[PDB]
C-alpha cells in the first residue's frame, strides 16, 4: 500500500530489534520467522529454532509470573508485554521483554503472532543495584543516626550525672562527722541515689552500643565507582532543577582505601545538601574534583554556588545537631566529619568566590 512489501521485509530483516513471527498450532506458537537481531539476542541460528515454540528460551526457569500472563493473552487474542528470564545458547542469562500481538489472517483463517523482543538485562541490573544501594543507604542512615544520637545524649548527660555523684560524695563526707539518729537512713538513701546515677550511666552506654553493633573495616575502592553510585542516589534530581554537573577526576588518584558504605553516605548527604542550597540559586553548578593532598594522601572536593554560609555558620558546622533548615537534623555533616577523619583524613568547609559552599575531605 504505502510501501513495497519487499522493502518493508528488508527493514524488518535489518532492524536492530529482535522481531519474530509465530504461528498458532493448538497449544504451540511455533516460530516461522526470526530476524538476525533475534539470532544475536538469543545466540541461536534460524535453521535450528524454527517451527517450535519460543518457550525453549526459558529452558529450566519456569517459575516466572509473566509466563502465565502471556499464555492467557495468547488464549484471549489480546496483545501483551512481559519481561522473562531467557537464556542464550551458551546458557548466559538475559531478561527478554516480549511485545506480542496476536493477528488473524483471513487468507489462511489462521492466527499468527508478531513479537518484538528487546534485551533489558542492563536495565534490570542497574535497577536491582539501585535497590541494593537504596536499602544499603537507608540501613546505614538509621544505624549511624541513632549512633550520633546516642553519643550526643550521652555526652550532654555526662555533666549532670557526674554532678549528682559528686554531690553524693560530698554529702557523705559531710555526714561522716554526724551523730544525728537519722543519719544512717540518709546515708542509705544517698547510696541508692548514687547507684541510680551509676545505673543511668550503665543504661545510656547500653542503648548506645545496641545501635552500634555491627561495624566494618576498609577496602580498596574506586572513586569513580563510588562517586557514580552515590550520584545515582543523591543527584537524581539535577536535571529537573537544572543543576550543571562536572566530575573532574584524576586517573592517578582513583583508588582509595575506604569503607564504601560510609563514603557513599557522606557523598549522598553532600550531594543532597548541595541540591537544597541551589534550589533558589540562579547559577547552579556542582563540581567534584580529586587531587593528591596532605603528605601522600588524596583529597576529594565538592563545591557549589548555593546559598553559602553566613559568617557564624561555618564554625558551627560539622557540629552535632546544628542546622539552618526547618526539618534538618544537623547530623549529616557531623557524621560525615567523623567518618572522614576515622579514615585518616580531615574534613572542613569554606565559602567559595561565587557565594556558595565548598567541602573538602581527604582519603588514603
Ligand X SMILES: Nc1ncnc2c1ncn2[C@@H]1O[C@H](COP(=O)(O)OP(=O)(O)OP(=O)(O)O)[C@@H](O)[C@H]1O
- Footprint on residues 256-275 left by ligand X (CB under 6 A): 269, 273-274
CB-based contact 160:167 (threshold 8 Å): no
249 interacts with, out of ligand X, a copy of itself, ligand FMN, none, CB within 5 to 8 A per kind: none
| 203 is a contact residue toward a copy of itself (CB under 8 A) | yes
Annotated binding site: 53-55, 58, 71, 86, 96, 117
What CA–CA distance (Å, rounded) separates 363 from 297? 6
70 interacts with, out of ligand X, a copy of itself, ligand FMN, none, CB within 5 to 8 A per kind: ligand FMN
| 328 is a contact residue toward ligand X (CB under 6 A) | yes
Of 264 and 269, nearer to ligand X (C-beta) is 269
260 CB contacts (<8 Å, ≥6 apart)?
Answer: 219, 221, 226, 229
What CA–CA distance (Å, rounded) separates 11 from 224? 40
- Footprint on residues 282-321 left by a copy of itself (CB under 8 A): 321
Of 70 and 298, nearer to ligand FMN (C-beta) is 70
Q: Which DSSP state fits 56? A: G
201 CB contacts (<8 Å, ≥6 apart)?
Answer: 161
Cell of 198: 551509676
Q: Which DSSP state fits 155? A: H
- CA angle at 74 for the pair 72 and 77, rounded to the nearest 5°: 110
Distance of CA 238 to the CA centre of its chain: 16
| 96 is a contact residue toward ligand FMN (CB under 6 A) | yes
253 interacts with, out of ligand FMN, ligand X, a copy of itself, none, CB within 5 to 8 A per kind: none
| 247 is a contact residue toward a copy of itself (CB under 8 A) | no
Q: Which of 15, 52, 58, 352 binds ligand FMN (CB under 6 A)?
A: 58
Annotated binding site for FMN: 53-55, 58, 71, 86, 96, 117
The CB-nearest residue to ligand X is 328
Amino acid at each position: 500500500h504505502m510501501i513495497n512489501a519487499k522493502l518493508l521485509q528488508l527493514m524488518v530483516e535489518h532492524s536492530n530489534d529482535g522481531i519474530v513471527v509465530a504461528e498458532q498450532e493448538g497449544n504451540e506458537s511455533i516460530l516461522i520467522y526470526v530476524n538476525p537481531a533475534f539470532e544475536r539476542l538469543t545466540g541461536y541460528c534460524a535453521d535450528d529454532i524454527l517451527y517450535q515454540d519460543c518457550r525453549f528460551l526459558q529452558g529450566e526457569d519456569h517459575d516466572q509470573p509473566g509466563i502465565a500472563i502471556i499464555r492467557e493473552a495468547i488464549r484471549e487474542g489480546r496483545p501483551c508485554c512481559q519481561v522473562l528470564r531467557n537464556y542464550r545458547k551458551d546458557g548466559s542469562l538475559f531478561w527478554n521483554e516480549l511485545s506480542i500481538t496476536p493477528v488473524h489472517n483471513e487468507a489462511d483463517q489462521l492466527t499468527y503472532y508478531i513479537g518484538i523482543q528487546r534485551d533489558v538485562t542492563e536495565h534490570q541490573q542497574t535497577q536491582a543495584r539501585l535497590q541494593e544501594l537504596q536499602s544499603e543507604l537507608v540501613h546505614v542512615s538509621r544505624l549511624s543516626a541513632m549512633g550520633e544520637m546516642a553519643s550526643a545524649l550521652a555526652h550532654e548527660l555526662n555533666q549532670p550525672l557526674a554532678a549528682i555523684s559528686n554531690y553524693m560524695k560530698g554529702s557523705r563526707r559531710l555526714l561522716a562527722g554526724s551523730s544525728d539518729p537519722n543519719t544512717p537512713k540518709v546515708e542509705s538513701a544517698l547510696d541508692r541515689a548514687a547507684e541510680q546515677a551509676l545505673r543511668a550511666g550503665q543504661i545510656i552506654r547500653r542503648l548506645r552500643d545496641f545501635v552500634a553493633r555491627g561495624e566494618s573495616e576498609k577496602r580498596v575502592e574506586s572513586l569513580s565507582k563510588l562517586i557514580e553510585e552515590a550520584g545515582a542516589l543523591g543527584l537524581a534530581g539535577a536535571r529537573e532543577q537544572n543543576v550543571q554537573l562536572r566530575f573532574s577526576l584524576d586517573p592517578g588518584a582513583d583508588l582509595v582505601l575506604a569503607d564504601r558504605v560510609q563514603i557513599q553516605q557522606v557523598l549522598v548527604n553532600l550531594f543532597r545538601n548541595a541540591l537544597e542550597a541551589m534550589a533558589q540559586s540562579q547559577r547552579r553548578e556542582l563540581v567534584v574534583t580529586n587531587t593528591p593532598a596532605a603528605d601522600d594522601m588524596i583529597e576529594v572536593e565538592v563545591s557549589d554556588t548555593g546559598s553559602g554560609f553566613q559568617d557564624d555558620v561555618i564554625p558551627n558546622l560539622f557540629q552535632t545537631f546544628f542546622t539552618t533548615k526547618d526539618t534538618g537534623m544537623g547530623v549529616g555533616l557531623s557524621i560525615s566529619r567523623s567518618i572522614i577523619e576515622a579514615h585518616g583524613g580531615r574534613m572542613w568547609a569554606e565559602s567559595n568566590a561565587s557565594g556558595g559552599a565548598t567541602f573538602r575531605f581527604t582519603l588514603p
